[PDB]
């Protein structure tokens, strides 16, 4: 199928209690493979998947060098933006950066991403065409001129369409055993009487990969988003994912309701019903 | 691999 590589950067200022906290993580699909923490002892880019340890000392030196460099630029950026918004030195402020590429089944470029936020809100983001920027507010408009003058769009596109794609290809190959696997969900259904005239059906999906899954409820065939509860797809901790969906149902009519579980690893869409 | 073209905001 299609695949993605994503890098996530978080810088948080601690005015008075030392230099800003910087954390970088690398992802291929829903699997993490690299990590950097500015507060960790090692002061290195560390591996968080087995298949990235195939890379030699040149990779780890360069990635360590470049992630340290990012944190240095963010440290200046935290000062610059503090100015733009006329904020005090006392306040703790966050910069977040997400960038990465998507490839089709053939491993060729599909889409590129690079979005930036200040205090958990849009600041600047690269458009789909990867030639122009969208600034969210007045402050970001100043960043937009600097990045236009520096031809940052062209260099980001060159990365997203080149180095990003061909490194994603390398990782998918080295990690084929895990990254191109599709584990089907272990599905079951639990019943909890709410009162004497109501009962909650809960449809379970356990130990599936990747994270993409759809859990819908049907009553006599027709779809049900009314009296429906849905939790965020959560990590098991072993590299698999968990999810459930529940419906408040009248007592006696449990058999009328049916859960529908759509997932790649499943040959056909499963159809579960209470025992 | 990390993108290393670092332009100040």
């Amino acid at each position: 199928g299609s695949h993605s590589m994503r890098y996530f950067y978080t810088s948080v200022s601690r005015p008075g209690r030392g230099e800003p906290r910087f954390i970088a993580v690398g992802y291929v699909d829903d699997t993490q493979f690299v990590r950097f923490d500015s507060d960790a002892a090692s002061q290195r880019m560390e591996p968080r998947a087995p298949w990235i340890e195939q890379e030699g000392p040149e990779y780890w030196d360069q990635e360590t060098r470049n992630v340290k460099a990012q944190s240095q630029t963010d440290r200046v950026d935290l000062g610059t933006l503090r100015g733009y918004y006329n904020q005090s030195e006392d306040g703790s402020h966050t910069i977040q950066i997400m960038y990465g590429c998507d490839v089709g089944p053939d491993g060729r470029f599909l889409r590129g991403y690079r979005q930036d936020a200040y205090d958990g809100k849009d600041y600047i983001a690269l458009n789909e065409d990867l030639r122009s920027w969208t600034a969210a507010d007045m402050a970001a408009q100043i960043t937009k001129r600097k990045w236009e003058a520096a031809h940052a769009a062209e260099q980001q596109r060159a990365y997203l369409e080149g180095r990003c794609v061909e490194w994603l290809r390398r990782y998918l190959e080295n990690g084929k055993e895990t990254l191109q696997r599709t584990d089907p969900p272990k599905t079951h259904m639990t019943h909890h009487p709410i009162s004497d005239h109501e009962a909650t059906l809960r449809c379970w999906a356990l130990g599936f990969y990747p994270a993409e899954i759809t859990l819908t409820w049907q009553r006599d065939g027709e779809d049900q988003t009314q009296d429906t509860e849905l939790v965020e797809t959560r990590p098991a901790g072993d590299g698999t994912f968990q999810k459930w969906a529940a419906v408040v149902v009248p007592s006696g009519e449990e058999q009328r309701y049916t859960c529908h579980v759509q997932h790649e690893g499943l040959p056909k869409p499963l159809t579960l019903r209470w025992e | 691999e990390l993108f290393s073209y670092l332009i100040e905001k």
Partner: T-cell receptor, first 112, second 113 residues
């Protein structure tokens, strides 16, 4: 607007010298380059906002530093005849991917 | 592995003539290629910066072309003058590196008055 001191320096083998570099006002980046007839222009080391950012082929006996005021000092220890060269520092307003403005350079001669 | 070469290393042209200065790089993975001027025993002055997306950059009598994959960049000097007489230095910045320059040995231009 980059200044380097001293402008010329004659020195004996085995001794230690310090080359000073003041970047342009408001510039965050300082790069150090060595120019010899032998090797041409070669990247030694670069600093960003008081911190080391990247190393080149700097020898163990060469160390450098960027101070809080953003000025830089390059220290050359156990000097050999071969170290005779022009040592340029270049400052940059950002990281130095677009612009690198060079100082007039410190000409080091190492004699026996 | 990135080797920047400028051949010929010495060019001698009559005054007023169009001249061609050559640059080569073995690895096409570059952010940009920057042409520099050096008067003897003095600092470098930036002539033209060519971004990897651009095929052409012009400024006065200086014109510079780039093809990354070919590993080629040419610097043209129209109506050459004695004042142009200097060493012309070619440099590139590597993908995955933080902006440091990798220089050629330079071409010493002598515009004969």
């Amino acid at each position: 607007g980059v200044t380097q001191t001293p402008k010329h320096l004659i020195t004996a083998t085995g001794q230690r010298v310090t080359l000073r570099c003041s970047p342009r006002s408001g510039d965050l980046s300082v790069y150090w380059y060595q120019q010899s007839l032998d090797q041409g222009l070669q990247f030694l080391i670069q600093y960003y906002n008081g911190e080391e950012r990247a190393k080149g082929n700097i020898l163990e006996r060469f160390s450098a530093q960027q101070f809080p005021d953003l000025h830089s000092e390059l220290n050359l220890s156990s000097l050999e005849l071969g170290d005779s060269a022009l040592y340029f520092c270049a400052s940059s307003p950002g990281g130095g991917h677009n612009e690198q403005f060079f100082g007039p350079g410190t000409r080091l001669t190492v004699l026996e | 592995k990135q080797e920047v070469t400028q051949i010929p290393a010495a060019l001698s042209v009559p005054e007023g003539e169009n001249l061609v200065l050559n640059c080569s790089f073995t690895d096409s993975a570059i952010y940009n290629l920057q042409w520099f001027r050096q008067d003897p025993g003095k600092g470098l002055t930036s002539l033209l910066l060519i971004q990897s997306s651009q095929r052409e950059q012009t400024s006065g009598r200086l014109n510079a072309s780039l093809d990354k994959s070919s590993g080629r960049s040419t610097l043209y000097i129209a109506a050459s003058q004695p004042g142009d007489s200097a060493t012309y230095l070619c440099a590139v910045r590597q993908w995955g590196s933080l902006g440091n320059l990798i220089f050629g040995k330079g071409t010493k231009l002598s515009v004969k008055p």
